[PDB]
Design a protein around this ligand. Sequence first.
Ligand SMILES: CCOC(=O)c1ccc(-c2cc(=O)c3ccccc3o2)cc1
Ligand SMILES: [Zn+2]
Lengths: 47, 161
Amino acid sequence: MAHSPPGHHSVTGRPSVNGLALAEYVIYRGEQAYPEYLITYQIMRPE
Amino acid sequence: GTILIDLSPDDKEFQSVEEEMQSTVREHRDGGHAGGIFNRYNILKIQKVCNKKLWERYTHRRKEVSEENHNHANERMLFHGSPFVNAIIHKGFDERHAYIGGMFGAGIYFAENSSKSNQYVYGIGGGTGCPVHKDRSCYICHRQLLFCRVTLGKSFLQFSA
Ligand SMILES: CCOC(=O)c1ccc(-c2cc(=O)c3ccccc3o2)cc1
Ligand SMILES: [Zn+2]
């Protein structure tokens, strides 16, 4: 596991090309996330 | 230490989470190769994850970050998809769950798009798909995602394609 840039706690990946894509994020310390909800699902075949 | 509490589909907490999941599906540039082709999900179950020791570990580190960033943890709820979900709910995130070849370096990655996290449920690039049918687009097998509380503090902004 790498380190965050000096002076930062995370990275925000911001798509500049696709307008419709939301952001992605990266943390470099396991204790900066808590897994609150576990979601069980299927993807659905389009009509 | 972990217990799972089932939410009723009639609870508003269930509904608020389901809606976050459904409304953040988008199209992917791979045309569905990694995650499959779908516009929505069948939600089978939502469980709250309760672990005292993991929570205090999170809240302790959240205070440290807040204090280094004008009392602002910059806390989000974000999706995480991974073959390691069972280890994560029992033992917490660590360097073993890192995306070593990720575009923003070797760390633990989270998405605003549920569909983006879905691309990793079977591994990087979707791996070989579901264990039973070897199908990245399986409509039968049960998948699991996490909706996590993530402390971003001061986040480095990387524009990108
Ligand atoms: C063999 C397990 O593979 C991993 O190291 C790994 C890599 C990436 C992910 C993962 C999980 C995600 O939810 C995700 C969201 C946005 C961007 C990238 C993302 O990547 C999970 C596990
Ligand atoms: Zn399957």
